[PDB]
């Protein structure tokens, strides 16, 4: 739960793959739709993420992305420590599952306002990050990181 | 230059279009490559940006994206005030130009490490946001927004 720790998560809808990164300490997320989960797609997504937030450590979502030399090359380039995703803490599996369930619920709630799944997923990222539960995840991530910088 | 103000900017390279959003108060940027600037591409980029940072106002980059009903629909959806981009302050005009020239310089310096332009542009976003000039733009943007939340 340090300021720089993120978890990758891959979930499926509509025959497509949604790759999500979660900032563990806040629950803030970024996500994208890709046709399938390859090391090149995962590597590009992590390069995007690390240019936008100070990403110190990534727990990868599965062993194929942990092994991928393209993902390792991107984590070298961007200064990220690439780690496995083992839930040594079983609360981990559970938190991720219930996030995927929450996102899929939101996506269903907006799905009819968008022709393409990718728009619906970015609507769901926006609603997830701005939901107050009281602060939102987008408020928590800024507070945490600002506290770290100071 | 309040915490929620961003400026769009469209620049060209390799026969492609790089769309950039600039957080005016910090100089932090997000950018993507698209084959050409359309209201649909611009609208999706602003939906992405506003799910990730608390975007209150966007000064659009030209009158076609100001007029575009697709862009106005996305700014409605995401709660953004869509504004023109008139440099009532002529310094504005100059600041954007010299950012495009800096990004293009950075892209040149990385361009041979990437097959695709879009990778080089995200490398350039990462180097720009982490450059210390002293704090970096990624540091300034978190400080500014956290101060606003508190």
């Amino acid at each position: 739960s340090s300021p720089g720790i993120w978890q990758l998560d891959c979930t499926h809808l509509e025959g497509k793959v949604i790759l999500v990164a979660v900032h563990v300490a806040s629950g803030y997320i970024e996500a994208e739709v890709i046709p399938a989960e390859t090391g090149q797609e995962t590597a590009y997504f992590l390069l995007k993420l690390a240019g936008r937030w100070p990403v110190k450590t990534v727990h990868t979502d599965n062993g194929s992305n942990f092994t991928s030399t393209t993902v390792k090359a991107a984590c070298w380039w961007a200064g990220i420590k690439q780690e496995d995703g083992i839930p040594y803490n079983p609360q981990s599996q559970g938190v991720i599952e219930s996030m995927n369930k929450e996102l899929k619920k939101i996506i269903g709630q907006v799905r009819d306002q968008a022709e393409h799944l990718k728009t619906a997923v970015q609507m769901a990222v926006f609603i997830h990050n701005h939901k107050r539960k009281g602060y939102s995840a987008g408020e928590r991530i800024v507070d945490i990181i600002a506290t770290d910088i100071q | 230059s309040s915490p929620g103000i961003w400026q769009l900017d469209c620049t060209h390279l390799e026969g492609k279009v790089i769309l950039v959003a600039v957080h005016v108060a910090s100089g932090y940027i997000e950018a993507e490559v698209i084959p050409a600037e359309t209201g649909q591409e611009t609208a999706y980029f602003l939906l992405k940006l506003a799910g990730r940072w608390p975007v209150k106002t966007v000064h659009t980059d030209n009158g076609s994206n100001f007029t575009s009903t697709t862009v106005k629909a996305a700014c409605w959806w995401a709660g953004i005030k869509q504004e023109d981009g008139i440099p009532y302050n002529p310094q504005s005009q100059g600041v954007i130009e010299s950012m495009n020239k800096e990004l293009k310089k950075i892209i040149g310096q990385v361009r041979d490490q990437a097959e695709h332009l879009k990778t080089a542009v995200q490398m350039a976003v990462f180097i720009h946001n982490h450059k210390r000039k002293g704090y970096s733009a990624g540091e300034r943007i978190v400080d500014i927004i956290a101060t606003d939340i508190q």
């Binding site: 590009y44 390069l47 030399t69 | -």
Partner: peptide
């Protein structure tokens, strides 16, 4: 091809 995005 010795590129980050195409290690081939």
């Amino acid at each position: 091809s010795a590129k980050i995005d195409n290690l081939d």
